[PDB]
Each structure stands twice: as C-alpha cells, then as structure tokens.
Amino acid sequence: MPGTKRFQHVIETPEPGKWELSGYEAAVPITEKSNPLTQDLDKADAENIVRLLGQCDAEIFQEEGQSTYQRLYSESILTTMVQVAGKVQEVLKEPDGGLVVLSGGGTSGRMAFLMSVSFNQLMKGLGQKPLYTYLIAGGDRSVVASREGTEDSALHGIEELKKVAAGKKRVIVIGISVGLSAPFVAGQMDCCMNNTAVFLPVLVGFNPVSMARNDPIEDWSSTFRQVAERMQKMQEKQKAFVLNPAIGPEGLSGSSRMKGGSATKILLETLLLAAHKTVDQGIAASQRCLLEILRTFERAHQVTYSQSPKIATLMKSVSTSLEKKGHVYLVGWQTLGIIAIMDGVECIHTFGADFRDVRGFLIFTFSQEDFLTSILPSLTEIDTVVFIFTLDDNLTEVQTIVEQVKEKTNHIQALAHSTVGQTLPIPLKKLFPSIISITWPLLFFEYEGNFIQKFQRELSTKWVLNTVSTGAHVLLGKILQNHMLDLRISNSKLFWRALAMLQRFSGQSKARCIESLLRAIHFPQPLSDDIRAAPISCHVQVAHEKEQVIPIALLSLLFRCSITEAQAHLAAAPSVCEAVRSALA
Numbered sequence: 001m002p003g004t005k006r007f008q009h010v011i012e013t014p015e016p017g018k019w020e021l022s023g024y025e026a027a028v029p030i031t032e033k034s035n036p037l038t039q040d041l042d043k044a045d046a047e048n049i050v051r052l053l054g055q056c057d058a059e060i061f062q063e064e065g066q067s068t069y070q071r072l073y074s075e076s077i078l079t080t081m082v083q084v085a086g087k088v089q090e091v092l093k094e095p096d097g098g099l100v101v102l103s104g105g106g107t108s109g110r111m112a113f114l115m116s117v118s119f120n121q122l123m124k125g126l127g128q129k130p131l132y133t134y135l136i137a138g139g140d141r142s143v144v145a146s147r148e149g150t151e152d153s154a155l156h157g158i159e160e161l162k163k164v165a166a167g168k169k170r171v172i173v174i175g176i177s178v179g180l181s182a183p184f185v186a187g188q189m190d191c192c193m194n195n196t197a198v199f200l201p202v203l204v205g206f207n208p209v210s211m212a213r214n215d216p217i218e219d220w221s222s223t224f225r226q227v228a229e230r231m232q233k234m235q236e237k238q239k240a241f242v243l244n245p246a247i248g249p250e251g252l253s254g255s256s257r258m259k260g261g262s263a264t265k266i267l268l269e270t271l272l273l274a275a276h277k278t279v280d281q282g283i284a285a286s287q288r289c290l291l292e293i294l295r296t297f298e299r300a301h302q303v304t305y306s307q308s309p310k311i312a313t314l315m316k317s318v319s320t321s322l323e324k325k326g327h328v329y330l331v332g333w334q335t336l337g338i339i340a341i342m343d344g345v346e347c348i349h350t351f352g353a354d355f356r357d358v359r360g361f362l363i364f365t366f367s368q369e370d371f372l373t374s375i376l377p378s379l380t381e382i383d384t385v386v387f388i389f390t391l392d393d394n395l396t397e398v399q400t401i402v403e404q405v406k407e408k409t410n411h412i413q414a415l416a417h418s419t420v421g422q423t424l425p426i427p428l429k430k431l432f433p434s435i436i437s438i439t440w441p442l443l444f445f446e447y448e449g450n451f452i453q454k455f456q457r458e459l460s461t462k463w464v465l466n467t468v469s470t471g472a473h474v475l476l477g478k479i480l481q482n483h484m485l486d487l488r489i490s491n492s493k494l495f496w497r498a499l500a501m502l503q504r505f506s507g508q509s510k511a512r513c514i515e516s517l518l519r520a521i522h523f524p525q526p527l528s529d530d531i532r533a534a535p536i537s538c539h540v541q542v543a544h545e546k547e548q549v550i551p552i553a554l555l556s557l558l559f560r561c562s563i564t565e566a567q568a569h570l571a572a573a574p575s576v577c578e579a580v581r582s583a584l585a
C-alpha cells in the first residue's frame with residue numbers, strides 16, 4: 001500500500017513484556033538506546049544528575065567484557081588507530097599535494113573544526129604548512145549555529161569535499177558520524193572509495209556497522225550501512241578504515257553531542273598527536289604511544305568530576321535563572337570561549353530553548369569593551385554569568401569584566417584551569433566564593449603550544465558545560481525518563497527518533513504510530529496517499545516549522561482520539577509535561 005517502502009525498514013512494535021524477545025531492542029542502535037543508569041534522570045536532584053552523567057561519561061573508558069562490542073581500549077580498535085596514524089604519517093612526509101579532512105554534521109562538525117585548528121597550530125609551530133581542514137554540514141556558519149536540517153544531503157557532502165580537495169594528490173577524509181548516520185558523511189566516504197588513488201576514507205563513529213543507518217538517503221542510492229560495510233571490506237587492504245568503538249548509550253537518549261562528541265575528540269586527538277610525535281621521532285606509532293594519551297584523557301574525567309559538588313551548584317543556579325525566565329551567559333577565552341558557544345547553541349535544538357537562554361561568548365566573538373558596552377547593560381538579579389578561563393589567560397581582562405557584572409548580578413561562578421602551583425590573583429579570588437578550579441598535574445610535553453594540555457582542558461570544560469546545560473533542563477521537568485519527547489523534527493534521524501519514541505511510550509503498533517505522527521505533522525491536512533508516499537524530507541520540512549508535534553501525536557494515540565481532540569486537551573492542561581505525564585498515567 002502507499003507509504004510501504006518509505007517505512008519498510010521500521011521494526012514492528014513489540015507486545016507488552018516482550019521488548020527484547022521481539023529483537024526490537026537488539027536492533028536499537030547503541031547511540032539511540034536508553035541508558036539504564038538514567039532511567040530516572042527525570043527524578044535525580046542536581047547532585048545525582050552530575051553523578052549519573054559523570055558515570056555515563058565514564059563508560060567511554062570501560063573495557064570490553066567477555067561475545068560483545070569492541071570498545072576504545074579493545075585491541076581491534078587500538079590497532080586500527082595505529083594503522084590510521086601510519087597513514088596520516090605518509091601524508092605528513094609528503095605535504096605537497098596532501099590534505100587531511102575532518103568532517104561531520106552538527107556536533108561532529110563542531111569537533112572537526114576545533115581539532116583541525118589545533119593540529120594546524122602544531123604544524124605551524126614547527127614551521128610547516130598547515131595540512132588540516134574541516135568540513136561541516138551547511139558550511140562554516142554551522143560551526144556556531146543550530147542548523148540540524150543540513151546533515152541530510154549526500155550530494156552536498158560530496159560537493160564540499162570536492163571543493164576543498166582541489167588539485168591535491170593525497171587526501172585523508174575522516175568522516176565523523178556518531179550514529180554512523182549522517183548522509184553528508186555517507187556521501188564523502190563513498191566518493192573517497194570511488195577514487196582511492198587520491199582518497200583514503202576513515203569513518204569514525206560509535207555504533208557497530210550492523211547498526212549503521214539503513215534507510216534510503218534521498219539523494220543517494222546506497223545506505224550508510226552499505227557504505228560502511230564496503231569500507232570495512234577495504235580495510236583488509238588498508239584502503240579504508242572504520243573506527244567505531246562502542247561507548248554505551250547517552251545519558252539523555254540520542255544526545256550524541258555529549259559522549260559522542262567527547263569520544264570523538266578523545267579518539268582523534270590521541271591518534272593524530274601520536275602520529276605527529278612519532279613522525280618527528282622517526283618511529284612508527286604504536287599501541288603504546290596511543291595508550292599514554294588515552295590514559296591522560298581518562299585521568300581528565302576523574303579530575304574533572306572530582307569537582308562534582310561545585311558542578312551541581314552551578315547547575316542549580318543555571319536552572320533557577322531559567323525557571324524564572326532569566327538568561328544564562330557563558331564567557332570564556334580562546335578555545336574555551338568557542339566550546340562555550342557550542343554548548344549554548346546546542347541547547348536550542350536539544351531542549352527547544354531560546355538562543356538567549358544559554359549563550360556563549362569568546363573574548364558571538366565580542367571583545368572586552370564591546371561586551372561591556374552592549375551585553376553588560378541587559379543583565380539582572382536572576383541571571384547567571386559563568387567565567388571560563390585558564391590562568392595563562394589575560395587575567396586583567398577577566399577581573400575587569402567580572403567586576404562590572406558583579407554589580408548587575410551576584411550569581412557569578414567560574415571555571416578555572418591551572419597547572420599545580422599557579423595562583424589566583426587575590427582580587428579575582430575574592431570575587432568567587434566556591435570557585436570550580438581544576439588543577440592539572442605537570443606532564444612532559446613535546447611541542448611548543450602544549451597541545452596535550454589544551455585537549456585536556458577543552459574536554460574537561462565540554463564535560464562540565466554539557467553536564468550543566470543538560471542537567472539544568474532536566475531539573476525543569478522537560479525530559480521524560482531519559483528521553484527528550486518534545487523535540488523539533490528537523491532531520492530524518494530525528495523523525496525516526498520521534499517514531500521510535502511513539503512506539504516506546506504508547507506501546508501501539510507501527511502503522512498507528514506512523515499515522516498519528518504524519519497526522520500531527522501535516523494537520524490540518526488529512527492523510528492522502530501522496531503524504532503517505534512522500535519522501536521523509538517532506539515530513540521534516542513541515543514538522544520543523546511546528547510546536548508540540550510529538551506530544552500531540554502521542555496524546556492522539558494514548559486517548560485514541562483525533563488531532564483536534566489532542567490539541568484541545570493539550571491547550572487545556574497546565575503544561576505539555578503535565579499533559580503527557582498524566583496521559584501516560
């Protein structure tokens with residue numbers, strides 16, 4: 001019947017109690033799974049939220065058990081990392097005509113960007129010409145914008161890759177997709193494989209290839225799964241690589257900006273730095289050079305979450321200011337400013353939040369007086385301002401800007417990174433009562449700009465900010481168990497996540513979930529055979545423009561009622577979250 005093909009890949013909803021014996025659950029990609037540790041995230045207080053997320057984050061470093069998924073520390077992964085270092089090196093030895101591309105959509109593209117800069121700094125620092133570039137879905141503007149719609153075109157990925165790959169002779173394309181999901185990346189990998197004289201593709205993500213997306217890509221003939229399966233075959237001859245450890249599910253189901261983004265840095269910085277230090281030593285990269293770096297990153301989780309109580313506090317003050325319709329500001333210097341801005345933007349699509357609700361600033365790029373004159377005026381008793389810097393920063397810029405803000409608001413808080421035995425100028429010190437200071441041991445660093453110190457701090461800040469922004473919103477009751485029910489459908493992945501969530505929370509059939517979703521999307525238009533047969537992009541484009549789509553679909557199912565009825569029931573309830581919560585009961 002119409003819509004049969006569009007929806008063929010969808011698994012049937014399991015009967016009550018057999019979620020598993022169906023094999024529905026064994027098919028849920030790890031990156032889409034519910035994390036058992038957070039099944040009551042919607043009840044944890046600030047302190048537990050920090051603990052549960054710090055624990056989810058810990059799973060990146062957890063080793064493989066004995067019939068189960070390879071992980072970061074597994075020998076198959078580390079060995080692939082070695083052989084990939086190997087190949088970066090070949091390009092490091094012939095810079096002329098050589099290029100290294102790091103590419104993803106959304107947070108994967110964001111991660112790509114940071115790391116491209118870093119490794120270009122390192123090559124510059126040695127007086128060599130920078131060989132790194134990034135690519136992000138929607139172009140460069142996406143790096144600091146919520147633009148969830150642009151990951152959906154394979155042609156567009158291939159375009160940008162063709163652009164940047166100019167008249168280069170040797171090109172390493174590291175396609176980064178956490179879910180092994182983004183059509184943007186799928187197209188690049190496939191293009192690399194049709195020209196391995198020039199291209200070497202390395203696919204990075206955190207699902208088994210058996211769980212990679214297998215739904216049709218609208219501008220492309222093969223699926224992500226097929227693309228990845230073919231890369232895996234080429235790996236035996238070292239012409240493609242698939243680097244895909246399991247890190248376990250996200251604490252907020254499907255929120256791959258968290259662990260997936262963190263693991264992406266951890267994995268690739270490790271690997272790239274190894275390749276660099278070892279080319280200079282004229283020695284092959286080895287599992288042992290990778291491990292040193294991996295273990296430093298693992299200390300970095302420990303170090304970072306040593307400050308949990310102060311993390312939970314800042315969480316409370318972020319959450320308060322948002323429950324009172326105030327705003328939260330994130331002010332930080334160099335690369336940590338950038339990470340600040342990434343976190344705030346991501347709250348827009350992740351939580352349905354205003355750009356002003358949690359916003360980031362670099363000293364978006366608003367310098368000292370500029371920020372003092374324009375942003376500083378608009379503050380308020382209930383707002384929160386957050387300062388994020390190292391002690392190698394312009395601490396005279398810092399204390400000034402804090403001085404002004406202190407009058408306009410008292411809920412200030414800071415996150416400061418020091419090597420041991422650096423001290424905080426006593427003015428600054430007096431301005432913060434419980435400060436989140438994170439002090440790092442000394443480590444022997446090979447290069448000019450201490451790139452290993454940079455990676456530790458960026459990562460630790462990411463964890464802190466992610467855990468804060470995410471927990472702030474959970475506290476406001478806006479998450480259901482460990483799902484964001486009320487998301488904006490802005491791409492095909494998110495369409496599938498909505499449909500899966502409808503099956504999960506209603507328990508009702510596939511066909512009914514699909515119908516209720518399309519009805520809620522296209523209302524006031526009824527279901528026609530055209531709509532049923534439409535490509536998924538048509539549904540996304542209409543759904544993107546609307547509110548409460550998923551809650552309305554779910555009410556419809558729960559009350560076995562029409563869209564008209566569900567909408568009017570929603571409007572006659574204190575809140576979305578109450579309407580849904582009470583219908584589920």
Ligand SMILES: O=S(=O)(N[C@H](c1ccccc1)c1cc2ccccc2o1)c1ccc2c(c1)OCCCO2
Binds near residue numbers: 032499
């Ligand atoms: O397009 S799919 O091949 N893959 C997506 C996916 C794969 C890899 C990374 C992210 C997302 C997906 C597959 C999938 C299977 C079970 C439950 C949720 C699911 O989400 C797909 C496969 C099966 C699906 C489904 C979608 O829609 C939701 C309901 C379950 O049936």
Ligand SMILES: O=P(O)(O)OC[C@@H](O)[C@@H](O)[C@H](O)[C@@H](O)CO
Binds near residue numbers: 108254346350
């Ligand atoms: O890396 P993927 O699986 O291809 O995901 C790419 C993007 O959808 C993803 O990063 C999204 O922007 C984030 O909001 C997920 O929290």
